[PDB]
Structure 1
Amino acid sequence: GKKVLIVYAHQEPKSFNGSLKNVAVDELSRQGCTVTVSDLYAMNFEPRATDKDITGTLSNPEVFNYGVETHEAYKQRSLASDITDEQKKVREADLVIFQFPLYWFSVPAILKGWMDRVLCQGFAFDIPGFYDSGLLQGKLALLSVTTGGTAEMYTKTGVNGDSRYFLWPLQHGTLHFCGFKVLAPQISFAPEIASEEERKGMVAAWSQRLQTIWKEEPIPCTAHWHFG
């Protein structure tokens, strides 16, 4: 028995991202997995890292330091409940899938805020207690990303460089840092450009990949994998 959290960042249910999220839910549900979706836009999820994220007495009220104050708030249980709600979902999950359109070679800001606010020190990592010693060790993570650019454009000799270059901050700097084993990303290239058959193909490839997701090995989340 397995628990899956899908962190989903798209404004439009009828979008290609919406379809990818829906087939994920359908297929994991069919397998008998426990499935939860955090639909960040529908939740109006707060992306800003602010002093509103701590409800208790601040450790240093004269000079506000977000990292210091959230680490302390986590230990004291004085974090805002929207953060601790998300942390519960992550804690219980065996696999976390991020479903999002690529925005400026990265996640949309609303999802960036989820990373900034939910993955605090004490919960997701400590110093020491990061990368292979990260606190979310034992969990799997997977990026399911859609692009405007074609696969052509995302090659080493294309304008945008290889797709793996833009994965580094997310796969390594965030997920690996927190101790996740990272599964190979699912990149669905340029669905707005693609034909009807090509889009249906991309949806079914994801659906089909999910059938055997629990048999996959993680990537070696290293500089060499990303950059060669």
Structure 2
Amino acid sequence: AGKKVLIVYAHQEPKSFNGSLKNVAVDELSRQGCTVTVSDLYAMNFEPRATDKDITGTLSNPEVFNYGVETHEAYKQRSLASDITDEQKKVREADLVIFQFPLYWFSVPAILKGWMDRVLCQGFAFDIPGFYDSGLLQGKLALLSVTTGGTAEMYTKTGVNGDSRYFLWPLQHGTLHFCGFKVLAPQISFAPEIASEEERKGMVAAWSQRLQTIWKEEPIPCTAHWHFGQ
């Protein structure tokens, strides 16, 4: 025991299906004795834009602004904006980061994309060297808990949306694996708006039940083969 969890949560409405999945996670992980922290991005009015306001004081090359370089240097010189370093501290302390969001355009809502863009800066999340298996958050687990509009059927290899694994690639491989996370299998709650009450409650219960043994889980092999292969 002694585990710390950060839930990064991206829904506008507390009473939403996403809201419920977030609350079940808080309740169940809290019941287990885990340390639990929630970043409620919409409630925090979290800034999604990557701008020169993210660096306090003097820039490293004020003639030509390169956000990635400047935030690298700012991390090294401890001059990042405080909303960013507040989140970095939650991530640093976490053993597990759960992302709770509705799927927006086969990806995360923009407010959560901005969290990924602004929080996972060079020197904090990865470096040269130290990416993919050697990324700087190695030792930590990440989990995507996604809800969709489209049905499970639509999310098959030959269905109109293709396999759900296809849209996970930029998130699980390009982002989280790159930064060194080992990736737990995603939690995909398909089409709750279309689903009946019974089906919805079933999906909530599947999540709660998964959470009972989350610390027993093996990570997926975050590979092209897993995402695209037979």
TM-score (normalizing by structure 1): 1.00
Query: Could you tell me how far 1:211 is from its partner in structure 2?
Result: 0.1
Whether the 8 Å CA contact 1:56–1:73 is kept in 2: the answer is: no
Identity among equivalent pairs (%): 100
The correspondence of residues 126-137 of structure 1 with structure 2, limited to 5 A, is 126-137=127-138
**CA–CA distance in 1 between the matches of 2:184 and 2:77?**
33
Query: Could you tell me how far 1:128 is from its partner in structure 2?
Result: 1.5
Query: Could you tell me how far 1:26 is from its partner in structure 2?
Result: 0.3
Q: In the alignment, which residue of structure 1 is the partner of 2:63?
A: 62
The C-alpha deviation readout for 1:157-197, integer Å capped at 9, x for no partner, is: 10000000000000000000000000000000000000000
Query: Could you tell me how far 1:127 is from its partner in structure 2?
Result: 1.4
**CA–CA distance in 2 between the matches of 1:212 and 1:146?**
21
Q: In the alignment, which residue of structure 1 is the partner of 2:54?
A: 53
SS in 2 for 1:87: helix
Q: In the alignment, which residue of structure 2 is the partner of 1:16?
A: 17
Q: Which runs of 5+ in 2 are unaligned?
A: none
**CA–CA distance in 1 between the matches of 2:58 and 2:32?**
46
SS in 2 for 1:126: coil
**CA–CA distance in 1 between the matches of 2:226 and 2:129?**
25
SS in 2 for 1:153: helix
Query: Could you tell me how far 1:202 is from its partner in structure 2?
Result: 0.2
SS in 1 for 2:154: coil
Whether the 8 Å CA contact 1:3–1:92 is kept in 2: the answer is: yes
Q: How many residues align?
A: 228
**CA–CA distance in 1 between the matches of 2:228 and 2:75?**
35
Q: Which runs of 5+ in 1 are unaligned?
A: none
**CA–CA distance in 1 between the matches of 2:158 and 2:114?**
32
Whether the 8 Å CA contact 1:141–1:183 is kept in 2: the answer is: yes
**CA–CA distance in 2 between the matches of 1:127 and 1:44?**
32
Which segments of structure 1 move beyond 2 Å, counting only runs of 4 or more? none
**CA–CA distance in 1 between the matches of 2:63 and 2:34?**
48
SS in 2 for 1:121: coil
What's the C-alpha RMSD, in Å, of the aligned pairs? 0.3
**CA–CA distance in 1 between the matches of 2:218 and 2:158?**
28
The correspondence of residues 26-105 of structure 1 with structure 2, limited to 5 A, is 26-105=27-106
**CA–CA distance in 2 between the matches of 1:36 and 1:116?**
20
The correspondence of residues 198-217 of structure 1 with structure 2, limited to 5 A, is 198-217=199-218
**CA–CA distance in 2 between the matches of 1:58 and 1:39?**
30
Query: Could you tell me how far 1:35 is from its partner in structure 2?
Result: 0.2
TM-score (normalizing by structure 2): 0.99
Query: Could you tell me how far 1:86 is from its partner in structure 2?
Result: 0.1
**CA–CA distance in 1 between the matches of 2:77 and 2:93?**
21
The C-alpha deviation readout for 1:15-47, integer Å capped at 9, x for no partner, is: 000000000000000000000000000000000
Query: Could you tell me how far 1:56 is from its partner in structure 2?
Result: 2.1
**CA–CA distance in 2 between the matches of 1:127 and 1:176?**
15
Q: In the alignment, which residue of structure 2 is the partner of 1:112?
A: 113
SS in 1 for 2:106: coil
Whether the 8 Å CA contact 1:24–1:207 is kept in 2: the answer is: yes
